[PDB]
Structures are given as C-alpha cells and as structure tokens.
Amino acid sequence: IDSVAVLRGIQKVAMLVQGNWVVKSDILYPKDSSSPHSGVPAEVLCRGRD
Amino acid sequence: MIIPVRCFTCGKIVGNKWEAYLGLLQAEYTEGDALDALGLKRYCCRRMLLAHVDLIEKLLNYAPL
Amino acid sequence: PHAAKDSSDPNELYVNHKVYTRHMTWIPLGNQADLFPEGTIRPVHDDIL
Ligand SMILES: [Zn+2]
C-alpha cells in the first residue's frame, strides 16, 4: 500500500501529537453517543479530549 | 454503600477523611503515601480506607431525584 | 440555578449534595444558651460526611 495513500487516509481520522498519531475525538465518540459513566453529550467529551 | 464514620477495631474518626483521600487519589499521591500523610499509623484505619468501595454515587444514579 | 452547560461534576451541578456534620445546629434548651457560650456545643471534626 502506498505511503501517500496511508497518509491521506490517516490525516482525516487522526492528528499529530509529538510525532505520533492519535485518533480524533469524534471518531471515538459519535454524535449520537454519550459518556458511559456520566451520560454527558459526546460534544463535551470531544472538547475535553481535544 | 458509604464510608463508615468510626473504625471497627479502634474507633478513630475516619469518615471525615474520605474526601481527603479521594483528593489525594486525584493528585499524584499513591495509596501508601496518601494513607501515611492522612495520619493513619496503625493498619486498621489504612485497611478501612483502602478496602472501602464507593457505591453511594452508584445508588444515587438510580435514586428518584 | 447557575452552572455550566455540561457540569459533569456534582459539586457544580448541585448544591448541598453532601450533608456534612457542620450543618448540625445546636438548639439550646432553657438556660443552656446562657450557660454555654456560642461555639462550644458543636461537632468535633465538623467535616464528617
Ligand atoms: Zn482504625
């Protein structure tokens, strides 16, 4: 698989943190999901993870 | 359910230190040094605070409210 | 009445949600208010949950 293709695929679902790649927050927490411990909306979880 | 006020063996007031132990946990203090700083020399109070499970919030999550 | 939109922490979501022993109020009887000065009859630790 091409490195440019892998890069284009990962840049849309991950971010660069100290040279490493971390998945985006919205990918882990969809819009219809919620916190399994407190029940807060997914937007707040995404903001906190960001 | 909730942290008891008195210790079973001796009887030292320990319910007032539950929130302090939780704060020490949120901090970088470990269980051992946290219990040491809380002033618990004898192991009875250390066990009372360490083996305690916090279920009051789990029950309030089901409370009528 | 005034809290954040999320307010995931109960400390900010609710008020007086932890009934500490400091809420106890000593009600004098007869001449006990005159016998004991204010502040003497109170919980010892004042922080027992
Ligand atoms: Zn004890």
Q: What is the DSSP string of C12-41?
A: HH-SS-S--GGG------TTHHHHSPTTSS
B49 touches chain C (CB under 8 A): no
The closest of A2, A26, A31, A3 to A13, measured between CA atoms, is: A26
Please classify residue B14 by burial: count the beta carbons closer than 10 Å to its beta carbon, then call 0-12 exposed, 13-18 middle and 19+ buried. buried
Show residues of chain C in contact with B2, CB under 8 Å: 49
Q: Check CB contact under 8 Å for B2 and C49.
A: yes
Residue with tokens 């440019």: A4
The closest of A45, A41, A6 to A25, measured between CA atoms, is: A45
- Phi and psi angles of residue B45, each rounded to the nearest 5 degrees, phi first: -65, -35
Q: Check CB contact under 8 Å for B15 and C44.
A: no
A40 touches chain C (CB under 8 A): yes
> CB contacts < 8 Å between B and C, how many?
18
Q: How far apart are CA C34 and CA B52, in angstroms?
A: 43
Residue C30 identity: G
Q: How far apart are CA A33 and CA A16, in angstroms?
A: 25
Residues of chain C numbered 9-48 and touching chain A (CB < 8 Å): none
* Known binding residues of B for Zn(2+): 7, 10, 44-45
Q: How far apart are CA A39 and CA A20, in angstroms?
A: 30
The closest of B56, B18, B17, B16 to C17, measured between CA atoms, is: B56
Residue with tokens 């008195």: B6
CB B13 within 8 A of CB B3: no
Q: How was this structure determined?
A: cryo-EM
Residue with tokens 């995404």: A46
When CB atoms are compared, the residue of C10, C18, C45 closest to B13 is C45
Alpha carbon distance, N-terminus to C-terminus of chain C = 24
PDB resolution in Å: 3.0
Which residue on chain A is closest to C4 by alpha carbon?
Answer: A44
CATH architecture of the domain covering B1-65: Orthogonal Bundle (1.10)
**CA B52 centroid distance within chain:** 6
What's the Cα-to-Cα distance from B63 to each of A30, A49, B29, B40, rounded to whole Å? Answer: 28, 30, 32, 34
CA of C39 to the centre of ligand 1 (A): 28
Residue B56 identity: I
